Amino acid sequence: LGSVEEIRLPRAGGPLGLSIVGGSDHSSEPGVFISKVLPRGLAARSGLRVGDRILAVNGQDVRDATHQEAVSALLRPCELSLLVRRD
């Protein structure tokens, strides 16, 4: 059963511990696909998973964001609150 979930990541200013692929400027479903989550990293601790799709970041909608627009959203200047879709 699919879900949508609000995930808070408390960034230290260093890495988030996740990777993203894709975006509205790639051919291959809304949002930014999470492609890697480091086990020891903050994203893993906060509950994020490979295959999650990021729909919003701190109120910025990124459902139809390009790759770079989603990178910028996640790296907003120094509590990262992510809305994600999970199958």
Partner: peptide, 8 residues
């Protein structure tokens, strides 16, 4: 099929 990937 080759998608940019960014580590964050």
């Amino acid at each position: 099929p080759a998608w940019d990937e960014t580590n964050l």
